[model samples]
Target: ELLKPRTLADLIRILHELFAGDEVNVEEVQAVLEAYESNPAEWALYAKFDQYRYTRNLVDQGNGKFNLMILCWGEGHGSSIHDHTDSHAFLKLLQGNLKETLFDWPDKKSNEMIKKSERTLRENQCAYINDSIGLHRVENVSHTEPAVSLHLYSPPFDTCHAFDQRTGHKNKVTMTFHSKFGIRTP
Candidate 1:
């Protein structure tokens, strides 16, 4: 089906249809993102940023099959290097610049995290990653402008591990939302 989402509601509905099968159609998903125009009117309601950390505002949960969130990043904010467990992760930049750095899986014995790749994702660009691709850390690269990104996780995960690159160690981290279904959470 053709997907050209003009609002967050439209995006969520398109995602529901696209992810109906057991396997995700990567190309279609990417196309849906590419077709979407970056306009604050689509997501500004939940684009709340935090001064100390990035905010993950839940947009929709596809009946436990998948979940979407709008992540708002303050200037200079970033995330700890982390894994997505066994789920597939897709990110679409809604605003500003974001630097994503991928790291190789930690060595069993050495616990060392090796750099795999790095790239900058601009507005309207999409990126995909899974555990097999390795761990990743995302940051708002712009020093002055806040960034906004739309994240989709298939078979949504609530817990994942954060890797300490320097020590090659990892720790369990429970994910929390800044908002759920467009309402801010306390």
Candidate 2:
């Protein structure tokens, strides 16, 4: 069925139709992102940004099934090397571009990862990762402008195992949010 999302209400309805019971995969999440990208009017709400760093602006924290957030990236800001734990995530860029790098190591518990590949995403482009094989770093690659992206994660990615490339160590980090529904609280 075609998604008819022009607002959050429409989006939630689409979410339930696509994700309420089925196990989400890369292709489905990619399709959801593509659907959001089809019309600016449907997703313009997530285009806000911050200057200090990337902002994790909550769009919707679903009832134990998913989370939707817009991660706003300021100039010179990016994500640390990290991996989601047993969750699926797909993010579509809203404005500006992002440089994404993928990494590989001898083992999942290795100290440092060997840079395997890298690429850049244009506006409305997407990047995705799942718990089984997702490890990456993303950054706002612009010299002046900030960037924003709409990220969707099923089963709420509240924690991730962050890797320290220097020593090859990992740490558990709880996710933080800068705002909910566009209001900054922390």
Candidate 3:
């Protein structure tokens, strides 16, 4: 059940076939999800996470403008509230459960944290986020299993602002941009 892409050409072909003629489409996302579900071995290629993961993939693509990654999250894993800057992102859940809480930027600056929006994600769920209102976080809610997901980003993610909730501190860091889940930078 080795699902790794046979070659870089094969990976590109699959992406081109799926994304051809459209900026974004539900059908294309669904097709990718279906492929991932049926071919877990192929999807396993996207499960690795490391600080150099995104950078390596960007080098493989050679254009540094687009990236797709699949991730598996252990129980209780999640992301902090953040924004994507000038990028558009797509997320599709393949297994387990996830909760996505969204926030809006407040007009008035205040000491209190602003709450703009929220949402939750379940299996087979897909979501899209653009620069306009992309501030949010995702959480893996499963207590005993891992959550798997796929993430596609346009123009690649080079640098982004990550925020700490308790301290209200923000730090800009280079993004590894590996898979959708379980990837971390050190």
For lDDT, the strongest prediction is: 1
- Report per-prediction Cα RMSD to one decimal: 1.4, 2.5, 6.3
Deviation of model 2 at 34, angstroms? 1.3
Q: In model 1, which regions exceed 4 Å deviation?
A: none
TM-score per candidate, in order? 0.94, 0.86, 0.68
Judged by TM-score, which candidate is best? 1
- Candidate 2: tens digits of C-alpha lDDT, residues 52-125: 77878788877678898888788889998788777788878877889888865336455557677889987877
Residue 171 CA displacement from its true place in model 1, Å: 0.6
The count of backbone overlaps in candidate 3 is 3
Total clashes for model 2: 1
Residue-level lDDT of model 1, residues 50-153, one tens digit each, is 78999999988886688889999999999999999899899999999899999988777755577788999999899998998888999997889999999999
Off by over 4 Å in 2: 7-9, 38-48, 105-111
State the lDDT at 25 in candidate 1: 79
- Each prediction's total of clashing residue pairs, residues at least 3 apart in sequence or on different chains, is 0, 1, 3
Cα lDDT for residue 127, candidate 1:
92
Against the true structure, candidate 3 has what lDDT?
Answer: 0.58
lDDT of 3 by residue, 1-186 (tens): 223334434555566554554355645554454444323554555555332211212212313456666655777777766777677677777567777777664333334445566677777677777668647777776678677776667656768777665444567877654423233333
What does the lDDT read for residue 128 in candidate 2? 83
